[PDB]
């Protein structure tokens, strides 16, 4: 019941619990020092950086966003970039222009893709391979302005194409799914979510408002059966947070979104059903043969009479 | 590089004298790693000039044995302890070592009772309470009242 | 043996009790630059050098309190507060020796 004081007060047995169970760090709060954005990996040679320094000054650098309007930035790239005789310098320059037009939401910057990069990357079987910094910046641009030009570029990043999908960020898939749910592409939701599953992305650490917007746009019956089997791939902490996020974005916290959600009740009830499931509790031919001989028997017995 | 690799080679060494009765013993030598790294900060040896494999082992031993003062004020909250218990209960099949399976040298004739007066100093409160009926013929020697002998 | 309890904890048990608990990084207390005579007591407010004990150790806090009190309080409010003799002057016999 106790230990007597005249007994020797030695340690009974040592306990090695932290070396038997090695626990990864898991807090309910998110990391306060994460970038929470799409990184571009500006890898300019250190001679064009000094040369284009008054032009790269008005462009977004690392964790810095200048207030330069985008019509001045596109006008600087239209005039000054054919003077620069380097292919990788002009491509990394346009990656910052696509990033600057994404943060300010200028829808007219997709003409810069058709002007310079479309004919050598995405036109009629182009053999050239674009840099990863350029494809990340244009996919971040088309998702931010809700442009439909993401689809031809995303199909180029597959294993038969450029194979740039294993190098995608978790925030790259977060801004991806938010735009497709806003536009309402049922096949675009399935083709991205199949690609995230095949590429082994961090499905639990996708932004929760991005998932519930992409899941809200599922209305077709064949893709609705895909979401049922796909929703088991999330964790139990994630799928209980998707229910609280879906209920808030359609309820009181509907003002957090720029465009309000559409009323999809079949996905609201199924997410609420699936989150309760993962949480703890708190022969037609032979059968039709049998029916016909019974009616044959009741007419012979007289239970089904004729006209009187 | 050579010293930290010798530390990681000694810490991953299994022993055979306790025959792994409770856990691995040499892992505590990874506790030497947050010391020696600080010595590098005194020696001017940059820790970024270490190889990636050794840096992985050094960050392993650092997240096993290092804490700061700000974490030490919050690491014992019951929320984190019960989250540890719940994470061991839910998925402990993924992280468990067992779930995979005078002076004595000049003393020779000691002088006893050297007229040191114990009545100058005061130790008067030496009262003791003995149980009733030690030699009584009607009171039994064995009994549950023997449990009264251990109570202070 | 039948009741053997050791009076010295064995080396294996000491090693297991040492290997389970981490170290505090500020126990190394290494120092090679010197003391920051100008900045270290004037750092950011969440991690600041907070004074303790007597009011003589609160130099900046008394200054900030006096500045805030002079900031928020108007003078047209502070005119109305009177002392005791200013009220006692209206008595017909305000002053006499004790």
């Amino acid at each position: 019941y106790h230990w007597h004081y005249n007994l020797p007060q030695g340690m009974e047995r040592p306990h090695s619990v932290n070396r038997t169970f090695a626990a990864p760090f898991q807090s309910n709060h998110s990391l306060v020092n994460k970038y929470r954005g799409v990184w571009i990996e500006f890898d300019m040679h250190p001679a064009f950086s000094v040369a284009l320094e008054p032009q790269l000054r008005k462009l977004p650098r690392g964790r810095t966003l200048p207030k330069t309007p985008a019509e001045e930035v596109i006008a600087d790239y239209t005039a000054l970039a054919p003077l620069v005789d380097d292919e990788k310098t002009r491509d990394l320059w346009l990656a910052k222009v696509f990033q600057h037009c994404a943060f300010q939401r200028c829808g007219g910057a997709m003409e810069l893709w058709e002007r310079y990069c479309h004919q050598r990357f995405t036109a009629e079987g182009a053999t050239a391979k674009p840099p990863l910094s350029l494809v990340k910046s244009v996919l971040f641009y088309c998702n931010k302005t809700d442009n439909s030009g993401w689809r031809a570029l995303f199909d180029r990043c597959l294993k038969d194409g450029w194979n740039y999908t294993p190098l995608f960020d978790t925030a790259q898939w977060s801004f991806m799914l938010k735009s497709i749910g806003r536009m309402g592409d049922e096949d675009g939701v399935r083709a991205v979510l199949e690609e995230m599953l095949d590429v082994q992305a961090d499905l639990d650490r996708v932004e929760a408002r991005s998932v519930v917007i992409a899941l809200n746009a599922v209305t077709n019956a064949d893709v609705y059966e895909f979401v049922k089997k796909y929703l088991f791939n999330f964790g139990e902490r994630k799928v209980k947070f998707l229910r609280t996020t879906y209920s808030d974005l359609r309820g009181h916290g509907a003002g957090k979104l720029r465009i309000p959600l559409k009323e999809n009740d079949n996905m609201y009830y199924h997410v609420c059903w699936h989150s309760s499931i993962r949480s703890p509790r708190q022969p037609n031919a032979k059968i039709d043969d049998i029916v016909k001989d019974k009616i044959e028997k009741w007419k012979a017995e007289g239970l089904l009479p004729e006209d009187y | 590089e050579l010293y930290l690799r010798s530390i990681m080679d000694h810490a991953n060494t299994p022993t055979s004298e306790p025959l792994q009765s409770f856990a691995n013993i040499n892992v505590v030598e990874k506790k030497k790693v947050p010391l020696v790294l600080a010595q590098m900060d005194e020696l001017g040896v940059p820790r970024t000039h270490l190889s990636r494999v050794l840096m992985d082992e050094v960050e392993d031993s650092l997240r096993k044995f290092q804490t700061y003062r700000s974490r030490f004020y919050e690491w014992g909250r019951a929320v984190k302890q019960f989250d540890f218990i719940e994470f061991r209960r839910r998925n402990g099949w993924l992280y468990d070592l067992h779930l995979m399976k005078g002076d004595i040298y000049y003393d020779d004739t000691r002088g006893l009772h050297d007229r040191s007066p114990t009545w100058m100093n005061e130790v008067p409160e030496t009262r003791y309470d003995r149980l009733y009926g030690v030699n009584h013929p009607d009171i039994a020697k064995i009994g549950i009242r023997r449990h009264l002998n251990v109570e202070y | 043996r039948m009741g053997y309890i050791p009076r010295y904890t064995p080396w294996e048990w000491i090693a297991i009790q040492e290997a389970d608990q981490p170290l505090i990084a500020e126990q190394i207390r290494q120092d090679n630059i010197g003391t920051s005579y100008f900045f270290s007591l004037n750092r950011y407010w969440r991690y600041k050098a907070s004074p303790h004990g007597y009011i003589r150790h609160f130099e900046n806090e008394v200054r900030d309190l006096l500045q805030y009190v002079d900031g928020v309080t108007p003078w047209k409010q502070a005119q109305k507060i009177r002392t005791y003799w200013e009220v006692r002057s209206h008595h017909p016999m305000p002053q006499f020796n004790r």
Binding site: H15, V17, N18, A22, A23 | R52, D56, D60 | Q17, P22
Partner: peptide, 30 residues
């Protein structure tokens, strides 16, 4: 009251995920 163990260590996180170890192996292979 039931006594708490004073020779049992405080539960703290010292380890990595399976995903973090897989990404470390992948980056070292690259």
């Amino acid at each position: 009251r039931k006594p708490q163990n004073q020779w049992e260590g405080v539960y703290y996180y010292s380890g990595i995920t399976k995903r973090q170890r897989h990404l470390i192996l992948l980056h070292r292979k690259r």
